[PDB]
Design a protein around this ligand. Structure first.
Ligand SMILES: [Zn+2]
Ligand SMILES: [Zn+2]
Lengths: 194, 49, 146, 49, 98, 116, 145
């Protein structure tokens, strides 16, 4: 409300058809007439942890002219690297900083607070483009599948669980066999605790 | 030979998508355009396999 | 500026270093501990702050000489203090409850909860007086480990 | 099916009917599956159970 | 199953298909509209004006007694062709249904 | 032609069609009120079974800033001759039976929407 | 035709009586609350039968008496039912947008948005929601439980 937003109680009902509605936790609060610049400002505010924490999900429904902001509990998120202008925001400098958190102090929270990793939830995934690998970013534009990437997977093997990630080469097996091993990994025998 | 056959089948299904987008795919009687397109794609991929 | 770009084998090493950092900080059961800490602090404070106050009025309608202005009481709960998990024995001596002591003795790994109570005594025609009952024990809440 | 808005997975593009986004697995079990087609094969194998 | 010339010719089998399939007014027309028409011989639609005076030149009823409200139904030509229907059948069906 | 609806100028209610026979005129009149006015057009209910959507008007020109949408660099803009365009299929109920592409010019000053 | 199913009311209520019960007697104001663009033909065609059905009710207290007569354990002599109708329209209809006083404008905005979404999905301009789409799901952990 301090940035540029017009509240619902202070507008005429005939001035809504051009603007973009804003929903905060499912409550319609008002409208805004520059949704792309506001969405970029909100992403910049979330990536610095200034006002908005990294937990908050923000969605820009482009074709329906909506902005939905969700802050409640129960939402499930995945960390993803940030891609802008066809390049990763993670550099070799951050890898050396992680080698010196293996020495001292550049923890994962500092990495998220630096603005290179965002928590994208399962509702924001409909509005973002996720690269499978950095190999997809370097393709020439003559045969490029996409040129506007917004995120990149850290590793695809993180889509598995706990009992399913003990399987050696699960991409060479049939899927019900992987399900059977995830069922039988809980029934194995070993040193359960020290 | 197997990889070349799979690549040729993928080029065939890309050409089928292109002719469907260019309004050149005549639907068969008894089913609509989506059903005809899905039948052609499934037939191409199953024949390739 | 291209020296900062991560090469391919450096990308596999770098991404597994990033995953190692994530699992070094967060761990594997972070959602349980985070939800419990949120529950304890904010949920218990919001329950004891959003609960309606007790409103009272005496009704001595079965006896003669009934006063037209009966005395009234009000009770308010405002603050929550949570201690460490502590066990009181049969003689009443407190002791720190270890999780292994709770497992071996079939006890409940719980911590007592204390609440501040404000009791306002009001008489029609007199100034109401406030009484503070601090650290009032109301029950033990179980504590999730780690 | 398009579980997302006109996308099977967020790594593909909207309104993609090509065989990679549709779910055709061009790799054998010896070669190993790409992650998108691994997830597609997981959805395919769940239906039998 | 079919017998005779319907069994071997696709046109008579299509005639059997048209005689069996439920074809309402939903499946055959383009659009509907309701007009107010004060003068039937001077109707607001100019494209109707070429032939409506043909129908009222030798009318079976008094044009003064009729109501001014008009229901204009434009039909799709391709759906008429596919169902092999004609307008005299539609007029006869209207006259026996109402 | 297609006609909209009209509102009263005295109580902002629903104006209904009505007919007078002394002048033999259609009038848009008010039932909760006493207002009446002359009708400019002559239709009162137009229904179209297969209805020709101008879905080029229905698609929002804000979709050029969509990373999830495809891009092409061969179909030039018919208005401003921009090479880059964004193509997608329709979202309606009749147009998934057509396999028809829809193109939006990616220029922020032009935003032309067309179909090839 | 469009109806509304209310908490603690076993009957079916048209939405126009509900909108008049929130303090909007005119039709242009309610169609402003639902149809954001007046240039759209088909949504104006779709909003007609609710307007035609709820023509008898034209005043706010008449709408509140319409609401209160259909609730469980109905009151007597109108006005208490009207009071009961307020207890449905302030504490039961949409508590997430507000339960305080003078919140009928935002509640009318949200109800018009719901009717706008229903009419958008009737004309096929937006996709239908999916039950098993996991974006529409939340996980109750140890905290909320
Ligand atoms: Zn009026
Ligand atoms: Zn252009």
């Amino acid at each position: 409300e301090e940035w540029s937003m017009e509240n619902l109680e202070e507008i005429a009902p005939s001035a809504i058809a051009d603007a973009t509605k804003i929903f905060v936790n499912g409550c319609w609060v008002g409208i805004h007439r520059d949704p792309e610049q506001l969405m970029a400002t909100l992403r910049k505010l979330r990536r610095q942890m200034d006002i908005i924490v990294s937990e908050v999900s923000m969605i820009r429904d482009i074709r329906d002219r909506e902005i939905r902001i969700y802050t409640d509990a129960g939402r499930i998120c995945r960390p993803l690297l940030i891609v802008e202008n066809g390049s990763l925001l993670l550099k070799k400098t951050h890898v050396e900083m992680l080698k010196e958190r293996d020495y001292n102090n550049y923890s994962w929270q500092v990495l998220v607070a630096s603005g290179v990793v965002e928590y994208i939830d399962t509702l924001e995934e409909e509005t973002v483009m996720i690269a499978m690998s950095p190999y997809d970013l370097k393709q020439d534009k003559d045969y490029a599948y996409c040129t506007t990437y917004t995120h990149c997977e850290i590793h695809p093997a993180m889509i598995l669980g706990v009992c399913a990630s003990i399987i050696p080469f699960p991409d060479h097996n049939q899927s019900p066999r992987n399900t059977y091993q995830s069922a039988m990994g809980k029934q194995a025998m070993g040193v359960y605790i020290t | 030979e197997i990889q070349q056959a799979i690549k040729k089948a993928k080029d065939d299904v890309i050409n089928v998508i292109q002719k469907a987008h260019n309004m050149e795919l005549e639907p068969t009687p008894g089913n609509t355009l989506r059903q005809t397109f899905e039948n052609k794609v499934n037939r191409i991929l199953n024949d390739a396999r | 500026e291209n020296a900062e770009e991560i090469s391919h084998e450096l990308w596999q090493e770098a991404c597994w270093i990033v995953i190692n950092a994530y699992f070094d900080e967060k761990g594997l059961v972070r959602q349980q501990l985070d939800s419990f800490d949120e529950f304890i602090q904010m949920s218990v404070q919001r329950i004891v702050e959003d609960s309606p106050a007790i409103e009272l009025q005496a009704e001595a309608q079965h006896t003669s000489g009934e006063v037209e202005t009966p005395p009234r009481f009000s009770l308010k709960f405002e603050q929550i203090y949570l201690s460490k998990p502590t066990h009181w024995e049969k003689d009443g001596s407190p002791s720190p409850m270890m999780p292994n002591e709770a497992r071996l003795r079939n006890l409940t790994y719980s911590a007592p909860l204390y609440v501040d109570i404000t009791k306002t005594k009001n008489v029609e025609g007199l100034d109401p007086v406030e009484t503070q009952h601090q650290k009032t024990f109301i029950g033990k809440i179980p504590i999730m480990l780690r | 099916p398009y579980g997302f808005r006109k996308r099977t997975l967020p790594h593909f593009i909207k309104d993609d009917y090509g065989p990679e986004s549709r779910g055709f697995v061009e790799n054998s079990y010896l070669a190993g599956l790409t992650p998108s087609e691994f997830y597609f094969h997981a959805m395919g194998g769940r239906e039998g159970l | 199953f079919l017998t005779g010339g319907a069994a071997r010719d696709a046109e008579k089998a299509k005639n059997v298909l048209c005689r069996l399939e439920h074809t309402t007014l939903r499946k055959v027309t383009a659009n509907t509209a309701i007009y107010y028409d004060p003068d039937p011989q001077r109707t607001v639609i100019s494209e109707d004006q070429e032939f409506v005076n043909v129908y009222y030149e030798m009318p079976d009823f008094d044009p003064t007694r009729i109501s001014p409200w008009l229901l204009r139904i434009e039909l799709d030509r391709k759906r008429m062709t596919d169902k092999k229907l004609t307008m005299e059948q539609i007029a006869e069906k209207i006259n026996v249904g109402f | 032609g297609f006609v909209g609806i009209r509102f009263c100028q005295e109580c902002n209610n629903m104006l209904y069609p009505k007919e007078d026979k002394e002048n033999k005129i259609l009038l848009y009149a008010c039932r909760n009120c006493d207002y009446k006015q002359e009708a400019d057009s002559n239709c009162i209910y137009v229904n179209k079974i297969m209805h020709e959507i101008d879905e080029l008007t229905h698609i929002v020109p804000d979709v050029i800033s969509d990373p999830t949408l495809p891009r092409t660099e061969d179909h030039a803009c018919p208005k401003c001759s921009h090479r880059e365009a964004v193509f997608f299929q329709a979202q309606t109920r009749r147009a998934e039976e057509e396999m028809r592409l829809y193109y939006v010019c990616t220029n922020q000053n032009c935003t032309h929407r067309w179909t090839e | 035709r469009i109806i509304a199913i209310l908490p603690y009311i076993k009957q079916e209520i048209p939405i126009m009586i509900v909108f008049r019960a929130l303090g909007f007697v005119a039709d242009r104001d309610i169609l402003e609350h639902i149809i954001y663009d007046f240039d759209d033909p088909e949504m104006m065609e779709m909003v007609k039968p609710s307007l035609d059905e709820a023509f008898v009710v034209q005043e706010q207290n008449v709408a509140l008496n319409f609401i209160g007569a259909r609730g469980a354990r109905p009151g007597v002599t109108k006005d208490k039912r009207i009071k009961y109708a307020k207890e449905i329209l302030q504490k039961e209809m949409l508590p997430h947008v507000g339960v305080s006083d003078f919140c009928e404008t935002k509640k009318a905005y949200f109800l018009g948005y719901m009717v706008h979404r229903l009419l958008l999905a009737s004309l096929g301009r937006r996709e239908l929601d999916d039950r098993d789409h996991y974006g529409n799901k939340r996980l109750d952990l140890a905290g909320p439980l």
